[model samples]
Target: SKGEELFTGVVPILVELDGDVNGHKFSVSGEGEGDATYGKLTLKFICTTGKLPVPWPTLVTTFVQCFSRYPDHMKRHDFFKSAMPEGYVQERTIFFKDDGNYKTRAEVKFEGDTLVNRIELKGIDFKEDGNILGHKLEYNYNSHNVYIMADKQKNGIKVNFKIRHNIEDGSVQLADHYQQNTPIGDGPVLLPDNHYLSTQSALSKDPNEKRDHMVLLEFVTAAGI
Candidate 1:
């Protein structure tokens, strides 16, 4: 996801949708953005969630059990150095740790009946301060810290991941900071500033503040859900 600051932000992420237990009955779909200047790589769930996590969570974690598709090393204008060098995906689990109520959503990928990528999410803790002044304020965040331990060796595969976050806003926040009037105003928000909450609700472009807030994610270049 690369472009202007409004979007075009990339923070390797995972989304668990809502659905079934035999494995969430889902779909993995995405298409081209610009013209033929780009390429399109699409594939469905190479594997489901039953094999990874050692013990996959059965109840709610089951909805997004179906992964969209195998990742394309090259998507858009960016390229990913393979996370694994030689092991074909046995089972690849995405632990949805600190994002929601789910403890973790696991993924299992296998090749020819053999296990490969086993991923698990630990837990999700509330990383936010209360909703002060009628506005959703403050938040702290972290990732599952993806682990790629292999049973065998494969070359050129690299799980090289860099983690650090940048806080940016192209628009002004309207909340005040005074304890009394603060309930209706924006404060002095500084980048890398601990004063602001980790996860704050952003105001939308007018005409309609009504959108499925559940899908309110401000990062990306991927097609909307």
Candidate 2:
């Protein structure tokens, strides 16, 4: 029953980042309602057969920060002009998504240093499948510029990141890329370029080698699963 609740009303956006990792593939997906923010969603992976894709821990870590905390008006950083905007979340407790294979423990809030807002993620844990995954990742925002960085390990493998993206830049390279395969009501929708983040893998020396492989994050308020 608890597992079913994890995805009760979420519409998942699938992200695939392919590279020369022994010629393997990495795919991460998130499900949330509205423009989801910290404590607002959850994530998972549709790994390539017989493989964990990217380091599972690192994949989970970035998945949480990227999709869970980004605001609905994500295309533009200062997009939400309301008194309570979506990006800079006040220090508080957030909840995990309804359905997933793991449990998430995280803290989201703002820190001083700029006239603009910044987000810090810490003390993250996911206990499931007889394994415990944990990490700390930080994202700094300047206007529409988004930068995410993190350092972590899994079974002695390096899965670090120094990823950057300009939300205002890029065009949709794929549409209707992921169709929900669960028994739930979650279906499909057309996602544009801004919904996707142009990313790089720590495993690559020339991150530019695979330009077509990118990470995508989308919020679907109307879809259900």
Candidate 3:
């Protein structure tokens, strides 16, 4: 699993080591293919972490492929927090045109420089049982947190994000802002009303249900200490 692969490390969590260990080096890369030829996502991780840089290629890809529908106009990047609140789980449910209530869930945590996140997809469809992955920055904000995560494999560029706004009023403002800025003649993105309940696997008419999600991106800051 991407979570175990990326988050699991030496229990002691070493900051520095002796001998040539500090000089230890490593590199990893991958790619994908599609309509875009030169555009296949490619990532190269080169580091000598005394430990090692946290890299979760598969998890990163799943994260992006899931949230690619959202536009960036409604998002912002924040850098105040070093890591997201531990055990933080952000899940939202969407109704399919058919009658399935598909829910997307994310969990995030980090200590020092190693951050980990898990993304899950569940619904009436057995295949909706999604996957995991894990963000960046150096700025400040009064409330709410935002960031981006990206990984380039051998085939395509995968990008994912999350947002957390604490202010109810601020949330209202952001929602209003998005409504006003929506592209001309563009309507809102909404789930179908006839979607079925993932748990019951029966027709559902829960149109009043609400789900919230934020976007965060991943990247290294500046580099070189």
Best by TM-score: 2
**Clash tally for model 2:** 9
Look at candidate 2 and tell me the lDDT of residue 83.
16
Q: Pick the candidate with the highest lDDT.
A: 2
Per-residue alpha-carbon lDDT of candidate 3 for residues 1-225, written as tens digits (9 for 90 to 100)? 112222222211111111111122322221211111111212222222322221122112223111111222321221112112232333444332222333445443444543333444443431121121011211112222222222122111122222221232332111100000011112222211111100000111224423211122322221111
Off by over 4 Å in 2: 1-11, 25-39, 61-225
Off by over 4 Å in 3: 1-87, 125-225
The pairs that clash in candidate 2 are 5-98, 6-98, 6-99, 7-98, 7-99, 35-72, 39-95, 186-224, 186-225
For model 1, the run of ten residues with the poorest summed lDDT: 176-185
Would you list the C-alpha lDDT of every candidate in the order shown?
0.21, 0.25, 0.22
Error of 1 at 106 (Å): 4.5
Model 2 Cα lDDT, one tens digit per residue, 100-121: 1221222221122111222222
Which scores better on TM-score, 1 or 3? 3
